[PDB]
Amino acid sequence: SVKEFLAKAKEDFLKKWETPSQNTAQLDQFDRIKTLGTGSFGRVMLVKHKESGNHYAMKILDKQKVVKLKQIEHTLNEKRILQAVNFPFLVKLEFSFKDNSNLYMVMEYVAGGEMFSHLRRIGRFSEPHARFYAAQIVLTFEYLHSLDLIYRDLKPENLLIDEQGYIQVTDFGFAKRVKGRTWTLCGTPEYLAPEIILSKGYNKAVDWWALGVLIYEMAAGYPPFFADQPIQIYEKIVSGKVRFPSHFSSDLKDLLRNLLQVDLTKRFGNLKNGVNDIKNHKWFATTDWIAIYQRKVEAPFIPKFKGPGDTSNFDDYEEEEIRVSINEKCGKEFTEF
């Protein structure tokens, strides 16, 4: 049963959670090839591990920039959580270390690009395409929530597509292990549950709302609430009125009406039956959850590939020399990293 598999997953996580890996590599073991993306406080680069020839994605986080965004705890959470978890649909952290200037997280390289890019290009996904991705998120959250983790940043920009067309969830910058309620206003505006915007204190149910945004964006080709400025977006979410495209099936509208629910006594994922309220919904009737976990379902889309360290499924970014300062920066802030 899920219950029993989750049980043993918990025991696995807690061991690593309590006794975290630290300092398992160094910058000079890696050759740096290309930038694959950029964020608030750093970049992700394709790199090659010199002594194995294995390719990795290396996230470089500028410590000074981290400190000035007040993201120190958030960054310690990310690395602490990522070394401890293990599930098919989550990026794998192989190595981590730090120097005078930066933090580094070396993860398995995912060659197929971000969902975002394939979704913007083709426009929208078919409901079966969208459902194949949704299922994988449904399982990943059931995993994470079972370890008392909240993810807090679901969106196509964060879903990497592997060689087999399956998802890897990347960027745990806002993931947090919390049993009670939490308060940080963080995430991405289009994806914020109304209780976050309203500073009420909130819980894992914000992830189930974010799933509603994603299913909707995947199937409509745009999100349920958009405007040019964030403030405009928050007003639409707090009204909460959703219109569905004429092409949405009945089942999809109904699954969404229950995910994009302001009332928490009513939101799917959050009720007495928990995740089975979602998994047993009619929209998922065709889904075989076990074959999904096992990766035996045929992917509706296989990204195009051309070789080992190929980067054409990612955009091009301006390169920037990695400078490492001769003085140590923010030592005590990042001691445990």
Binding site: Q71, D153, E157, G187, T188, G221, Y222, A227, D228
Partner: peptide, 20 residues
């Protein structure tokens, strides 16, 4: 159309995380 309204908006590129 809603599509056309989206495509014409400034929020079709990769969307930054916020904090506060």
């Amino acid at each position: 159309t809603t599509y056309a309204d989206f495509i014409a908006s400034g929020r079709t590129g990769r969307r930054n995380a916020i904090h506060d």
